[PDB]
């Protein structure tokens, strides 16, 4: 996420151990994203379009579970 | 239910606690089948805990379990 | 006061505790759009 948001990243600028392995992983991820439309790199979404897994919209599935728990207890 | 009905002020703090501890008490009380759909819908790490380790057989339908692991 | 005071509440959950009440609440909140 930091590399994505910086936007001033350079591959050869990086120094330290694990440099080559992470470089290879990033190159493979970019190649996979180019070839396959599926997204691997993290992406940011505004507060308007809250998606399925977020904490804001747990309550729907949770209330479904709550209703089934009530059903079982009433049975 | 009270928090989501707006009867008293709604605070995310301790609401995360309510959610997580409800899941905890549900899994302790052996409500695995109910938690299956919740894990599938939200995405979690207890999907392995309940779906395979206590629900569906491992020898069958191996591929989804392998992908999850 | 911070330790010992709890926000007030109203007893409107008597009907919602029933499973049918939860179905009604789920339908209303899902279709709130």
């Amino acid at each position: 996420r930091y590399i994505q948001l910086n936007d001033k990243f350079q591959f050869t600028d990086m120094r330290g151990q694990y440099a080559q392995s992470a470089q290879a992983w990033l190159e493979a991820a970019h190649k996979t994203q180019s070839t396959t439309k599926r997204r691997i790199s993290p992406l940011g979404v505004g507060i308007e379009s809250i998606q399925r897994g977020h904490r804001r919209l747990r309550w729907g599935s949770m209330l479904d579970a709550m209703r089934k728990c009530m059903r079982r207890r009433e049975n | 239910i009270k928090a989501r009905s707006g009867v008293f002020p709604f605070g995310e703090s301790e609401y995360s606690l309510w959610e997580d501890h409800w899941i905890y008490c549900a899994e302790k009380l052996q409500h695995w089948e109910i938690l299956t759909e919740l894990a599938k819908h939200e995405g979690f790490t207890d999907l392995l805990l309940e779906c395979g380790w206590r629900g569906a057989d491992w020898i069958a339908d191996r591929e989804p379990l392998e992908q999850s692991v | 006061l911070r330790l010992l005071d709890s926000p007030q509440s109203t007893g409107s959950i008597s009907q919602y505790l029933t499973s049918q009440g939860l179905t009604q609440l789920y339908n209303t909140l899902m279709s709130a759009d």
Partner: peptide
Amino acid sequence: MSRIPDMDLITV
């Protein structure tokens, strides 16, 4: 707009 509506609630 998302599938699930997002509505503001009062806080502490």
